């Protein structure tokens, strides 16, 4: 369970609480939240005070639970306001408490997993992490676990690493004190004079030189940073994603005017004039790169791998790069519908589109209707243009409002923040974690009714009122999906088609396809009937569900009548002896004929049970009339 | 092209929109929380073109569908990591694109999108005024669960447990009984025959409608069926973006289960509240909130029913002139009235067919034909006639 602005914890202090560790002051709490190993993490003051309040509440609850155990306003061991507590050594209470422990363990695991995903998604709760206390093994493990796994392209990894190094070197002055340790790796990064060798030959190269790609690529990325004012990882990702596409003149055109190419080349040349001295003491797109297997195997690129990890786990700032690169928004994410229509303004005429969809077999769109269609299409375009501006601003405002807090089930959703985060989660693992949390909550709620009991006199008065099968039991025909499947499949024609009417599924591929389609239609009709029965009492929902039933039944009956006609007409008998011997006993044709007419499911009077209604046809139609 | 892009996005372990607050993309609750394309159509008028859930039963159906497909998505993700390893080993853009399109064709991702099949000009307009099939192909962010249900066995459980079904049956019976007694109270007041009398007195001012000289031609023209008779519906003004989003959000907000709703609300508040809790304390708070919500809902339903039907004594229990002192008002509901009508219906009734000793009462078709039907031959004959459309005998 996680919202857009959740604070899922990442530390496990329940072990310390059960062993007796108590943080007394702020220094003690910080010593608790310190990680004595690799992958150090820096937090925010709000997150820290939230964690401190949580720790104090945990301590108060633990001591209250200890007080309740000693007893063995309202302590956790107290009963509900209208319940009584069973003896401690009883089977019901022991099972309930075991379920309580299981549910709480599941909830803690879900919270820890959510916190881990939040930490590795680079949310504002954890501003940064550092890998200073990490070895080469730890660096390679991080690389494999995050970058290689989440990257489809190997060359994009090299591009990202070089861009991270370039942007870090360019923005070196504006960094806190804790960010100084990465500059050692930045300097230790080794490049190869690949272009030097052909000039000398006019091509032998060292393997260690081949492992590192080149230095002209780094100069190209520095040129890119100078051109596009790259200052954070989100914009680095955007400009690295949409620079190989042959539209960087317009697609990557930044909202601020980019610097002149001559100025950028002068800056690059000055940097090279300093770099040559240091070593002694518009560029084209970069070419091929050595494999990432070499990257993570060799230690020549080890500082490059370290700075790549640093850039991947840092430089993530909560801001949208689309305010700086408005054109790149359409390439990075799906464009707005209004913008899609504006781009396909040359869609000819809506009347022409309708004509090409309908085809030549039909009358060609009377002129007055075509004119009305064109006028309506133009009006729709005008409405889209008018509302495009209002929709963008209003949509952002509604997400961050009091309504989202009041009803977080619908308005609040993770991965719905205004800023862009290239390392956003797939929202499938988070959904699974939410499912585990809610099932644990259901188990805990089930166990809380087993832990406690009602009064003996209350249960005695309850038992004085016996339950009779006549009128005090749930009907055996309660609406369930298998209940509605069984009634449909027990129909003589449906059963005939399923068993022997259709060709055998295993032997015939087309028979298997027909069986799949028949099952799909049967399931659709049964699901529609089940929904109609569930929402039978609600008038409008009953009407719309009955429309769904009509559609599904019509589809199923069309398929069934087609199959019945085909199996009746498939009299593929080479000789008359085969026909006579088929007619001698009950074959498929004669069994199909004996059944009689197939009653259409559309013309039926089922209601809330799958059984024909006892009311008159007029009343049934009035009930199942389409909504007005 | 679009299929290859969708398959690449599905391969990627990141959000296709990167968590960005994008227009016309809805983080559907029933579809887990993955974004889905929900453009705000203006041909229908400020209407979001996305399914609007009606019932928490549909919500649970969707949730259990995701539970059922959880097995498929794991193996699919293993296959996706194998394909991603193959792409990483690949170094040619053409080879990558060919592999992507082959995998998309194998996974049937292009079948995730659904195109409006229509031939009628109005139906075509309602979909092609804005986002046409081209826009459907373009903004077609696929889902791993959608791909899983593209090829997977169909579940039958629907995910509703015994307690949920018991509650649903109880509330269905309660709503049906309350509606029936409200209608019987209305009939007892007699406003139904007042409606009939109002219809009778309204018939005075009516006049014979004009069915046309050629009645078939006139009826067809009214239906808009003949060539050139099609009239487009009026262009309704689109709603505000806030209202258009709010209706869709409330559709799922009123269909969420109580446990999930309270859990989400308490987890959202836990960051802001001055006394945050972790673990067992939060679990206890959730349980207490759920119990309080249940008992308050029961109390509110009972109180609204009592207010509507005027239940309970009208003031002091022990009056000088007897404990039963009811003041009846014209055209108002009362517990005494309800009890009296029930008494008139079934004072000393042992069976529904108690007064069926005479054929005239016995053969009445007011309540239904259940008592008239007595053999399976007659039942089958009646159902066959009803299915064939002819009048029931």
């Amino acid at each position: 369970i996680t919202s857009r602005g959740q604070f899922n914890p990442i530390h496990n202090f329940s072990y310390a609480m059960e062993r007796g560790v108590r943080a007394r002051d702020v220094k003690a709490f910080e010593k608790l939240i310190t990680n004595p190993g690799p992958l150090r993490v820096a937090y925010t003051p709000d997150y820290l005070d939230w964690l401190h309040r949580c720790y104090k509440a945990k301590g108060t609850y633990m001591d209250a639970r200890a007080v309740a155990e000693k007893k063995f306003h309202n302590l956790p061991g107290a009963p509900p306001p209208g319940m009584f507590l069973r003896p401690a050594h009883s089977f019901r209470r022991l099972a309930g408490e075991l379920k309580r422990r299981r549910a709480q363990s599941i909830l803690d695991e879900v919270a820890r997993a959510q916190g881990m995903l939040d930490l590795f998604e680079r949310q504002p709760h954890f501003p940064a992490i550092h890998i200073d206390r990490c070895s080469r093994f730890h660096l390679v493990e991080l690389f494999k676990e995050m970058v290689l796994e989440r990257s489809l392209d190997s060359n994009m990894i090299w591009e990202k690493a070089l861009l991270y190094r370039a942007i870090l070197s360019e923005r070196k002055p504006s960094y806190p004190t804790s960010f100084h340790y990465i500059f050692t790796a930045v300097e230790d990064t080794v490049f190869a004079p690949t272009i030097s060798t052909p000039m000398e030959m006019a091509r032998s190269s060292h393997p260690l030189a081949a492992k590192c790609p080149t230095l002209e690529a780094y100069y190209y990325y520095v040129y890119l940073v100078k051109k596009y004012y790259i200052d954070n990882a989100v914009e680095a990702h955007v400009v690295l994603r949409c620079h190989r596409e042959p539209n960087a003149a317009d697609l990557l055109f930044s909202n601020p005017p980019p610097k002149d190419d001559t100025e950028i080349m002068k800056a690059v040349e000055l940097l090279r004039n300093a770099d040559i001295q240091r070593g002694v003491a518009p560029p084209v797109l970069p070419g091929a790169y050595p494999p990432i297997d070499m990257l993570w195997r060799c230690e020549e690129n080890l500082p490059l791998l370290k700075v790549l990890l640093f850039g991947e786990f840092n430089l993530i700032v909560s801001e949208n790069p689309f305010v700086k690169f408005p054109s790149a928004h359409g390439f990075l994410t799906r464009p707005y519908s209004t913008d899609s229509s504006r781009t396909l303004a040359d869609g000819m005429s809506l009347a022409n589109v309708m004509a090409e969809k309908r085809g030549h077999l039909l009358p060609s769109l009377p002129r007055n209707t075509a004119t009305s269609i064109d006028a309506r299409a133009q009006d729709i375009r005008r409405l889209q243009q008018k509302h495009h501006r209002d929709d963008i601003v209003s949509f952002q405002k509604l997400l961050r409002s009091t309504h989202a807090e009041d009803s977080p089930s619908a308005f609040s959703s993770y991965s719905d923040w205004s800023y862009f985060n290239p390392r956003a989660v797939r929202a499938e693992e988070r959904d699974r974690l939410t499912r585990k949390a809610v099932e644990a909550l259901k188990l805990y709620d089930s166990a809380t009714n087993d832990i406690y009991r009602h009064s003996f006199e209350d249960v005695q008065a309850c038992h004085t009122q016996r339950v009779t099968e006549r009128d005090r039991t749930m009907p055996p025909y309660l609406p369930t999906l298998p209940h509605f499947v069984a009634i449909i499949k027990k129909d003589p024609h449906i059963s005939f088609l399923l068993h022997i009417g259709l060709p055998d599924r295993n032997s015939s591929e087309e028979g298997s396809a027909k069986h799949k389609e028949l099952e799909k239609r049967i399931y659709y009709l049964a699901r529609a009937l089940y929904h109609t029965a569930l929402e039978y009492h609600n008038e409008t929902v009953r009407r719309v569900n009955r429309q769904k039933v009509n559609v599904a039944a019509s589809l199923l009956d069309n398929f069934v009548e087609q199959e019945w006609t085909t199996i009746l007409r498939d009299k593929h008998d080479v000789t008359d002896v085969t026909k006579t011997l088929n007619d001698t006993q009950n074959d498929k044709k004669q069994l199909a004929r004996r059944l009689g007419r197939y009653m259409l499911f559309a013309n039926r009077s089922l209601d809330d049970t799958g059984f024909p209604t006892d009311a008159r046809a007029d009343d049934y139609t009035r009930w199942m009339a389409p909504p007005s | 092209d679009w299929a290859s892009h969708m398959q690449r996005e599905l391969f990627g372990e990141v959000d296709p929109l990167g968590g960005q607050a994008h227009k016309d993309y809805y983080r559907d609750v029933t579809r887990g929380y993955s974004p889905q394309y929900a453009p705000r159509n203006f041909a229908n008028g400020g209407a979001v073109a996305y399914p609007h859930i009606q019932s928490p039963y549909e919500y649970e159906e969707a949730a259990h569908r995701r539970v059922w497909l959880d097995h498929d998505v794991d193996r699919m993700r293993e296959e996706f990591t194998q394909h991603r390893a193959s792409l990483r080993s690949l170094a040619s853009a053409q080879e990558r694109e060919e592999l992507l399109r082959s995998r998309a064709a194998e996974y049937q991702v292009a079948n995730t999108v659904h195109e409006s099949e229509s031939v009628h000009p109005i139906q075509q307009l309602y979909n092609s005024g804005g986002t046409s099939r081209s826009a459907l192909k373009q903004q077609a962010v696929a889902d791993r669960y959608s791909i899983a249900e593209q090829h997977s066995p169909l579940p039958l459980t629907t995910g509703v447990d015994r307690d949920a079904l018991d509650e649903a049956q109880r509330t269905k019976d309660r709503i049906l009984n309350d509606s029936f007694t409200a209608e019987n109270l209305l009939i007892t007041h007699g406003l139904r025959e007042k409606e009939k009398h109002d219809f009778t007195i309204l018939q005075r001012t009516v006049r014979i409608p004009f069915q046309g000289y050629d009645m078939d031609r006139f009826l067809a023209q009214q239906k808009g069926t003949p060539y050139g008779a099609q009239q487009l519906p009026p262009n309704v003004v689109p709603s505000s973006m806030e209202e258009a989003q709010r209706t869709l959000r409330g559709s799922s907000a009123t269909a969420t289960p109580l446990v999930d709703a309270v859990a989400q609300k308490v987890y959202a508040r836990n960051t802001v509240v001055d006394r945050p809790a972790i673990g067992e304390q939060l679990t206890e708070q959730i349980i207490n909130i759920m119990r309080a919500s249940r008992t308050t809902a029961e109390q509110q339903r009972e109180e609204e029913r009592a207010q509507r039907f005027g239940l309970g004594r009208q003031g002091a229990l022990v009056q000088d002139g007897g404990p039963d002192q009811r003041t009846l008002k014209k055209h108002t509901n009362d517990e005494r009235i309800v009890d009296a009508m029930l008494f008139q219906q079934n004072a000393y009734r042992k069976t529904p067919t108690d007064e069926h000793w005479n054929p005239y009462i016995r053969r009445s078709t007011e309540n239904g034909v259940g008592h008239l039907l007595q053999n399976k031959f007659d039942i089958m004959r009646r159902e066959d006639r009803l299915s064939k459309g002819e009048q029931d005998l």
Partner: peptide, 30 residues
């Protein structure tokens, strides 16, 4: 506001539409 799921006498109806008039003027015989 005619109620739903209501059994009406064959000689009359709710009156919602033409197919369900207030008073049925058509016989149910042959």
């Amino acid at each position: 506001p005619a109620a739903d799921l209501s059994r009406t006498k064959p000689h009359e109806g709710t009156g919602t539409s033409e197919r369900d008039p207030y008073i049925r003027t058509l016989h149910n015989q042959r």
